[PDB]
Design a protein around this nucleic acid. Structure first.
Length: 39
RNA sequence: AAUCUCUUUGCCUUUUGGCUUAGAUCAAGUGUAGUAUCUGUUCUUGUAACAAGACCUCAAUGAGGCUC
C-alpha cells in the first residue's frame, strides 16, 4: 500500500503539472512568460 | 484502483551555457603561394570402297560389371 500510494501520488503530481503545461518557439514563449512573471 | 475537477496564491517544473579589435567584414581588373595533369589520333572439293545417370561389394570410395 505504501508503494501504491507513492506511485499514485507521483502520477497525480505528474498529471497535474501536465495539465498546467497544456494551458516563436516553446522555449521562447516560456522565456517571455518568465519575463511576465518578473514584471 | 479508491474519489475527481476548477480558480487564486507558492514553487519555474524543456524557462537565454565563455572570451577579443561590437572578433572582423558587407569587399576588392584581385594579388600571392602551393598541388597536379596533359590533351588527341586510334587498334588486333566431289564420288566410291572398308572399319568402328542408376544399381551391387568393400568403407575417409574408388576400382571392377558379355550390366542398362
Amino acid at each position: 500500500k505504501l508503494a501504491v500510494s507513492l506511485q499514485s501520488e507521483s502520477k497525480k503530481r505528474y498529471e497535474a503539472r501536465k495539465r498546467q503545461m497544456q494551458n516563436i518557439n516553446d522555449k521562447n514563449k516560456q522565456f517571455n512568460e518568465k519575463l511576465s512573471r518578473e514584471s
